[PDB]
Design an enzyme around this catalytic site. Sequence first.
Site, PDB file in Angstrom:
ATOM      1  N   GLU A 205       0.836  -1.192   0.000  1.00  0.00           N
ATOM      2  CA  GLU A 205       0.000   0.000   0.000  1.00  0.00           C
ATOM      3  C   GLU A 205       0.882   1.257   0.000  1.00  0.00           C
ATOM      4  O   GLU A 205       0.642   2.192  -0.769  1.00  0.00           O
ATOM      5  CB  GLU A 205      -0.926   0.042   1.229  1.00  0.00           C
ATOM      6  CG  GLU A 205      -2.152  -0.875   1.189  1.00  0.00           C
ATOM      7  CD  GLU A 205      -3.147  -0.504   0.096  1.00  0.00           C
ATOM      8  OE1 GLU A 205      -3.065   0.621  -0.444  1.00  0.00           O
ATOM      9  OE2 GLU A 205      -4.025  -1.340  -0.215  1.00  0.00           O
TER      10      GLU A 205
ATOM     11  N   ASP B 160     -11.619  10.269  -7.922  1.00  0.00           N
ATOM     12  CA  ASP B 160     -12.964  10.568  -7.444  1.00  0.00           C
ATOM     13  C   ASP B 160     -12.983  11.736  -6.463  1.00  0.00           C
ATOM     14  O   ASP B 160     -13.996  12.004  -5.818  1.00  0.00           O
ATOM     15  CB  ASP B 160     -13.576   9.319  -6.803  1.00  0.00           C
ATOM     16  CG  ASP B 160     -12.834   8.873  -5.554  1.00  0.00           C
ATOM     17  OD1 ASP B 160     -11.594   9.017  -5.507  1.00  0.00           O
ATOM     18  OD2 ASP B 160     -13.494   8.367  -4.620  1.00  0.00           O
TER      19      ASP B 160
ATOM     20  N   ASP C 224      -5.791   8.786  -0.511  1.00  0.00           N
ATOM     21  CA  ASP C 224      -5.423   7.744   0.447  1.00  0.00           C
ATOM     22  C   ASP C 224      -4.227   8.234   1.254  1.00  0.00           C
ATOM     23  O   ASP C 224      -3.253   8.721   0.678  1.00  0.00           O
ATOM     24  CB  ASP C 224      -5.056   6.439  -0.265  1.00  0.00           C
ATOM     25  CG  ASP C 224      -6.216   5.846  -1.032  1.00  0.00           C
ATOM     26  OD1 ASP C 224      -7.367   6.012  -0.590  1.00  0.00           O
ATOM     27  OD2 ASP C 224      -5.977   5.200  -2.071  1.00  0.00           O
TER      28      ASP C 224
ATOM     29  N   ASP D 114     -15.408  -3.539   9.145  1.00  0.00           N
ATOM     30  CA  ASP D 114     -16.514  -2.903   8.433  1.00  0.00           C
ATOM     31  C   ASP D 114     -17.268  -3.780   7.434  1.00  0.00           C
ATOM     32  O   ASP D 114     -18.000  -3.270   6.583  1.00  0.00           O
ATOM     33  CB  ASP D 114     -16.012  -1.626   7.739  1.00  0.00           C
ATOM     34  CG  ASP D 114     -17.134  -0.641   7.431  1.00  0.00           C
ATOM     35  OD1 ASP D 114     -17.962  -0.382   8.328  1.00  0.00           O
ATOM     36  OD2 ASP D 114     -17.185  -0.119   6.299  1.00  0.00           O
TER      37      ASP D 114
END
Length: 129
Positions: A35, A48, A52, A101
């Site tokens: 990542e 969008d 991050d 989540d």
Amino acid sequence: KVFGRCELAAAMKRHGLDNYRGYSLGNWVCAAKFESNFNTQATNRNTDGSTDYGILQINSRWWCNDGRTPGSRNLCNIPCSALLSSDITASVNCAKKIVSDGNGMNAWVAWRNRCKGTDVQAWIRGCRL
């Protein structure tokens, strides 16, 4: 700050990530490697309007407030800038909420693409944990 592999492993183990929700420490170290390449300052702007942040690339659309993401929610109740610190505490606490989540570690696309189903135990090799 750029963590060494075992250095990060120790830090995460210290924050209770080993086997958290059934995910071995290796999974977390592997996710961090792909990542952000262990860089706490890493940032990636998405097409969008979101971005991050940090070692675990947490998204500004739902988890942290960076004051410039449309219809953003601040579920972790923190400024995205706090996710860019040399202390991973903030990122880990927020990550613990994300992994619970409803999607497991699938929430991290790099984990899914490069860690899922692999021998993640290798990411802990040579570490004195």
